[PDB]
Design a protein around this ligand. Sequence first.
Ligand SMILES: [Zn+2]
Length: 278
Amino acid sequence: WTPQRAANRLVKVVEAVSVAHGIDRFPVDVPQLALECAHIFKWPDPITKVQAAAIKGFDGALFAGESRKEWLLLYNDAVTSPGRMRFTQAHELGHYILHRMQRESFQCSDADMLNWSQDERDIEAQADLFASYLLMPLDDYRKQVTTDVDMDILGACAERYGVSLTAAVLKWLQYTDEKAVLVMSNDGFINWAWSSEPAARAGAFFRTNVIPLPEGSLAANPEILHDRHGTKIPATVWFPHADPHIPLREMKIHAAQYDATLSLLWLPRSAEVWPPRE
Ligand SMILES: [Zn+2]
């Protein structure tokens, strides 16, 4: 099984069960799927318990029982949010479907839940991709982002799918044809960055080292608490090799669910920011 094929099957289950009950599909009820997952995939070793706990040091876990005949899905419910809990549950369900023959257990941190990538050998990234496909099926998500993008629109996605704002933005970056970069920072320093595919192709990405924010950015000003629609500034503030007249829109919002600052940078479709070829 792959993240996309496994999620596709479970999205069909969600659709069918929601219709049968006469209820909304979203947000997805992950515990219900987890308890049915062995039946849905025709396996003998089910998840038999999905349990909230106050967990220190990680956010979710999947533990094989004695003789690997049943599995326990534990998720943190302390100092978190419903959207983080739902994503953690889906992430652990991803390990159950995709990875459980590799290990006796999985214990997964908030960082694991933010590490979305397309590297198929990174099991944390693969569980994140699974969770993104299950919780935010693209057919439906695309209908939520049409004529404009801003933190209000992406916040509405987060509410609709029952995920964090960060997860809703990452989903958009996963598929958009726009050139955009999300930067998560704390106390003036960049901790994570993620680029849309067009941005990455154009050189607009940051490898993460703890690196200060640009001194002229909206992000770096503690006084600016939020800018949900995005102020137009020179692209060179963030991407020094951009041509000097290229603008960028910089959005800013406090990520309550992660207690950090999110900066969403939106570049023109034509922008290229690679350095000169020496
Ligand atoms: Zn994990």
